[PDB]
From Swiss-Prot, chains A, B:
The keyword Nuclease applies. GO terms for molecular function: DNA binding; RNA binding; RNA endonuclease activity. Homodimer. Forms a complex with MazE which is no longer active as an endoribonuclease. This is Endoribonuclease MazF. Belongs to the PemK/MazF family.
């Protein structure tokens, strides 16, 4: 079952310019009716390139709790609809508190900030 | 000078599975701080294959007022982060009212619902 808050390995290549590419973890951010009843998910990329949030659309995740190669950052400015066939293995699942920070950074990202 | 609510022509290809592909209009949904400073924008795909919003993640836009080929639909479940270089000509920009429907559909799409 694909749940919002799941983190999967996914090949994001090919990409252009500053789009995040590579085989990497991504977190599911699509609502759960969409995850269940549609062939696509929306995800946010995760990078181990940095371990500290630089901007308010970044959210940190710790390797000790989440089974990643490295302390990492979720990039809510790099979001994409992905076909489900791009999801490889299921790495982890984020806590409810981690998902609140994600909800926040995503509202800032999309200017929904006027809640 | 890209701004939230602008509509551009952009090339989405190559894609996989049910990801929207091809050269087509997209609406900018990224916050304006990111549009000013970032090398990437976040967009939602527009399609003319349908003209009516069947689901609450779809927003109808009218052809004459927005200068499109057909009565179209913004697909808030088809989102992409694109390098600015993918954006060809600006086509139009959505009204504030219409942008509010877009925001509602996006809350639902990304499960920020309750907000």
């Amino acid at each position: 079952m694909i749940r919002r808050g799941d983190v999967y390995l996914a090949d994001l290549s090919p990409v252009q310019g500053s789009e995040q590419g590579g085989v990497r973890p991504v977190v599911i951010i699509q609502n759960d009716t969409g995850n269940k009843y549609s062939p696509t998910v929306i995800v946010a990329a995760i990078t181990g390139r940095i371990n500290k949030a630089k901007i308010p659309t970044h959210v940190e995740i710790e390797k000790k709790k989440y089974k990643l190669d490295k302390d990492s950052v979720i990039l809510l400015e790099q979001i994409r609809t992905l076909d489900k066939k791009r999801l490889k293995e299921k790495l982890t699942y984020l806590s409810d508190d981690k998902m609140k920070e994600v909800d926040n950074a995503l509202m800032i990202s999309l200017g929904l900030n006027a809640v």
